[PDB]
């Protein structure tokens, strides 16, 4: 169904090897989070913007609405 940016993994799996807690940028379209993002702020490309969502062990599963479920107000 949904796709998980493989370009974020190429950088997040590297952060899971040493323990780096940085952010991974993405530029696909329907980019979704993964289990390897439980300690990274990956700016998933929602189609037009890279939302650096710091995923924990219970935020992944969507794409960015689980880390940014807030409106302008």
Curated annotation (Swiss-Prot):
Q: What does this protein do?
A: Protein S19 forms a complex with S13 that binds strongly to the 16S ribosomal RNA.
The source organism is: Thermus thermophilus
The lineage is:
Bacteria, Thermotogati, Deinococcota, Deinococci, Thermales
Its Gene Ontology cellular component terms are: cytoplasm; small ribosomal subunit
State the covered range within the intact protein.
Answer: 8 to 80 of 93
Per the UniProt entry, what are the Gene Ontology biological process annotations, in alphabetical order? ribosomal small subunit assembly; translation
Which GO molecular function annotation, any one, does this entry have?
rRNA binding
Q: Which family does it belong to?
A: Belongs to the universal ribosomal protein uS19 family.
Report the superkingdom from the record.
Bacteria
- Annotated protein name in UniProt: Small ribosomal subunit protein uS19
Record keywords:
Ribonucleoprotein, Ribosomal protein, RNA-binding, rRNA-binding
């Amino acid at each position: 169904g949904v796709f998980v940016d493989d370009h974020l993994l190429e950088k997040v799996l590297e952060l899971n090897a040493k323990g780096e807690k940085r952010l991974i940028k993405t530029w696909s379209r329907r980019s979704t989070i993964v289990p390897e993002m439980v300690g990274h702020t990956i700016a998933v490309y929602n189609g037009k913007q890279h939302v650096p969502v710091y995923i924990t062990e219970n935020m992944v599963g969507h794409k960015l609405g689980e880390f940014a479920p807030t409106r302008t107000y």
